[PDB]
Every structure is written in structure tokens, then in C-alpha cells.
Amino acid sequence: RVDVSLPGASLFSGGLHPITLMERELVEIFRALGYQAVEGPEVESEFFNFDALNIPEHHPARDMWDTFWLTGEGFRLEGPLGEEVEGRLLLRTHTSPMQVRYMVAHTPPFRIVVPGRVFRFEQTDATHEAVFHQLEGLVVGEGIAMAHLKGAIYELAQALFGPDSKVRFQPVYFPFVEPGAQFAVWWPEGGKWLELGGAGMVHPKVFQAVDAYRERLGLPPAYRGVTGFAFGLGVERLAMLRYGIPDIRYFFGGRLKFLEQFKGVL
Amino acid sequence: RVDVSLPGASLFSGGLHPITLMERELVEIFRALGYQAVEGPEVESEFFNFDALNIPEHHPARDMWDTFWLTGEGFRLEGPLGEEVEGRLLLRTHTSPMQVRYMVAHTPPFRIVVPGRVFRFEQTDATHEAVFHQLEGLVVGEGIAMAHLKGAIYELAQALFGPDSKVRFQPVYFPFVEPGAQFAVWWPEGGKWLELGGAGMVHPKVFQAVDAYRERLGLPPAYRGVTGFAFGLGVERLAMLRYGIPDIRYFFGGRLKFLEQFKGVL
Ligand SMILES: N[C@@H](Cc1ccc(O)cc1)C(=O)O
Numbered sequence A, B: 001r002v003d004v005s006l007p008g009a010s011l012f013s014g015g016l017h018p019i020t021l022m023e024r025e026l027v028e029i030f031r032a033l034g035y036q037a038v039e040g041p042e043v044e045s046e047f048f049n050f051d052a053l054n055i056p057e058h059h060p061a062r063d064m065w066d067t068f069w070l071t072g073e074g075f076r077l078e079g080p081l082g083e084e085v086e087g088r089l090l091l092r093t094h095t096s097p098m099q100v101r102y103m104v105a106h107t108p109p110f111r112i113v114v115p116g117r118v119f120r121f122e123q124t125d126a127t128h129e130a131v132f133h134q135l136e137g138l139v140v141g142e143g144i145a146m147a148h149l150k151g152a153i154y155e156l157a158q159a160l161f162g163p164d165s166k167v168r169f170q171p172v173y174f175p176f177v178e179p180g181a182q183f184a185v186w187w188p189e190g191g192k193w194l195e196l197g198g199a200g201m202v203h204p205k206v207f208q209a210v211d212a213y214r215e216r217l218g219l220p221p222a223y224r225g226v227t228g229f230a231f232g233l234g235v236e237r238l239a240m241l242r243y244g245i246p247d248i249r250y251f252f253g254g255r256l257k258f259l260e261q262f263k264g265v266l
């Protein structure tokens, strides 16, 4: 005879990080809409992070991003076509540069979503990080209109908060879009509007930067007669509201008591 | 000191069945197109397997499906709305009945894909099984046209065989569609056309059966002013060509030497 209620061999049981879970859900939501996920580098060139996105130097708009500037010789930053890119190095302040890289390397129409680690020089508190994640979206092609951007986010909301969810758009500014907009989604349970992210129609100067860099690389122009929309949303804020995580600082804390709590979560 | 090239603890390493892999790829291909996967029961009623799909008794068309008829009291077959359905029981000869179940239980527009185990009374050889799998597709909604069906399969092909892949449609008969069609996809490597599955525009009588069963259940009609397309494709045939599996019989053989060979495969 054997006691069957006796503990068995202590085989280890793994788990996924909250951010990996939230990012996966977001990526799934958009895959169902035809978006494909691709990634960019965490260490970027000012050209891709700012200049190519219509964000000058000593431009008031630069202030919307507190940047970590890097230094050191011997580092090789490869451009979209594997080339050796140059320019002052920094930690990307957002995933947006990736939409420039992708466009020089591909041709419309397409739908991409690019999750990624981003960095801002900031003070770490209960709802603020210097190291966090964003999910960028970019859909370009003949006839793409703001009505489609709104449709996308409407689908994001429904997919995230159920049939009783709603979306709200208000004009807001971004050097890389025009019209520009901020969007919030209605969260029926918490009974409140959550400011989710920014978006808009890709700015004319962005398409121009893309086709200039293409020509400078021998590629033919590809974004002359197309339009598109782009959006960007913070992951931690969403992960927090979705898992009831009180301190944004727990994500990079590494505390098992914390991480372990998400083994169930799919 | 320790020999580091010495074998480590023999922790077990799992794996997925070839069919699970192929089905997963197919389901992913279509999820990117907005289709959602749902399943039906393996033991069906003649009503759902045949009658509701415009396939009479002692109808020549019945012969396109060699059926396993079942017997035994005490079995409860639940309909789409959980009700107690009746009718001669059988093993579903295809996943098609599931498109009737789904429609009585939902409202257009929608996109579904239903993978599933099916049964045909047949002799088991190198390329034939009595027990195999199918993947059904069903997209219904205002304005849905055959041009969309073709677009779907075009996307299936591209997704499965690359940019140099092509699709081919030819008229063929199915009591549940009109127009009816068979489609083949060009496989650039094997340099040949693969007859993949059947499809067409959902037959008027199918929508009628759906709305009659709905009314008989108190639900209001929902498929009066819509159209849709449906397709069905065999999985084993595809899995075989895709993994280079020579004998369709290996799938249900249970031989580890065989199964083990697909641990890598994603
Ligand atoms: N990249 C911006 C957010 C954003 C992203 C895409 C847009 O189209 C607009 C705004 C940020 O770091 O806050």
C-alpha cells in the first residue's frame, strides 16, 4: 500500500512574466486583425528615434521624451538593410523609430505591430518608470483613412473589455502624425475612461524621410501614393489595470513572490 | 572537478502530435484573417450531419459520405442552445454540421474555422483513413461574395507555400453550396497542384434550415438578408505533404519513433 495524498517529486514549475502575458494578449488581439509583430533595437540612432520622425533638435517637441544618451566606441548599429548606420546613439524613447526602419525595408500595403522595451530618463515611483514597454501599430496603404484607425482601436477595446466597452478620440500632438490624437477606452468594471495611447495619420514628412533614406540606399520610392495610421500604447499601465498590480515597480523588481502570481494567467 | 560533458538528469521531454501541429498552423493562418476557432461534437445527429445541410435520404449525394451509424440508449446529444436534440445518431462524416450549429447559436456577420475529427466507413490504406481530420471555414454576412472565398484561399496558399504559390478553382458539387467548387494550390517545390478542399457560397436551403430551427427554438431569424462562403479541407493530406509523412496510417499508429520526430517542429 502507498499514501497517495503524499507530496510527489518536486519537479520545477515555470511561469511567464506579467509583461510577457500582456504583450502576448495585445499581439494576439492585433494578429486577429491582420497585424504582424516585428521588433527593433533598444539602442537607436537619433536619426531614427527623432529626425526621421519629424522631431528636430531644440524643438519644443523634443521635450516630450527625456532621453538617455549613450557613449562608447566599437559599437555597430545596423540599419534596416543591415547597413552601418551612424548618428548619436541613445536608448529609444519609444518604439516609433521602428516604423521608419520597417518602411525603408518593405513595401505597402501592410499591418505591423511592434512591442518593445523603451527608456526615458525619469524618476521611478508608483506609476512611473524609466524602463517600460510600448506597443506600436502601423498600417500603411492606398486609401487608409482615420476611419480605419478608429476601427482598429474600437476592436482593441472590444477585445480587451467586452461588448460594453467604448473608445474616445481627442485631438493631441505628435510631430509624426497629422491629424494627431489621444484615445481612451471605457472600462465598464472600473467605471472609468483609461487614457491608452496616441495615434493619427502618418505625417507627410515621415513618408518623405523613408523614401529619401531608401533612395540614399538605392531602393525606389514606395510611399509616395499611400497613407496610413499609427498608434502607440503603454503596456505597464494596461498590465497594471488588468492584473490589479499596484506598483509599476514590481515588474522589474524580480521578486518571485510577485512573478509567481502569474503562473496561472493562461 | 567535474566532467561537464557527462549526461545530465534524464528529465522527460514532451512533444506535440503532427496533426496538432498542422491544425495549429491552419488555425493560425486563418486567425490572422479574423477567423475564430470553435468545435462541434464527434457524435452527431443525422439532422445536423445531413438534413440541415441539404443532404436527403436516399439521395445520390448521400453516397459522398460512407457513414458509421451508432446505437445505444441513455446518450444525451445536446443541440446548439444546450437543448436535447434527437434523430438517428452517427459519427460526423465531416465538420460541416458545425456550421449549422454555430449559425443557430449566433448572428452574422462572423468568421469561423472549425477543426475536427471526422469518420467515414472506409478501408485503411497508405493514403486513406476511416478516422481523419478536416478544417471547416464559414464566413457569413451582408455582401459576402465568391470573390472573398477566392481571396481567403489565395491567402491560405500564400501563407502555406510562399509568394510563388497559386490557387485554382473549378466547379464541383456539394448539396450545401451553390456555386460549388474544388480548389487546388500550387506547390512550387513539389512542382504540382494539390487538390486541397471544397467550397462555395452557402446554399439558400442551409440558411433556411438554420432560421427554421431558430424559430422552432424561439430565436428570431438571422440569415434572411446575408450570404456567405464555406470551405472544407483535409488535414492529413496537408500534414503529409508538409512533413513528408509517407503513410497516413502513422498518425493513429501511436508509434513513438514516429511521434518523437515532431518535437522540433515549432
Ligand atoms: N511614440 C509616442 C506615442 C505615439 C506613438 C505613435 C503615434 O502615431 C503617436 C504617438 C510616445 O513615445 O509617447
Ligand SMILES: N[C@@H](Cc1ccc(O)cc1)C(=O)O
Residues within 6 Å of the ligand: B093, B094, B095, B096, B136, B174, B176, B177, B197, B198, B199, B200, B229, B230, B231, B232, B233
Ligand atoms: N464537408 C465536405 C467538404 C466540403 C466542406 C465545405 C464546403 O462548403 C464544401 C465541401 C466533405 O466532407 O467532403
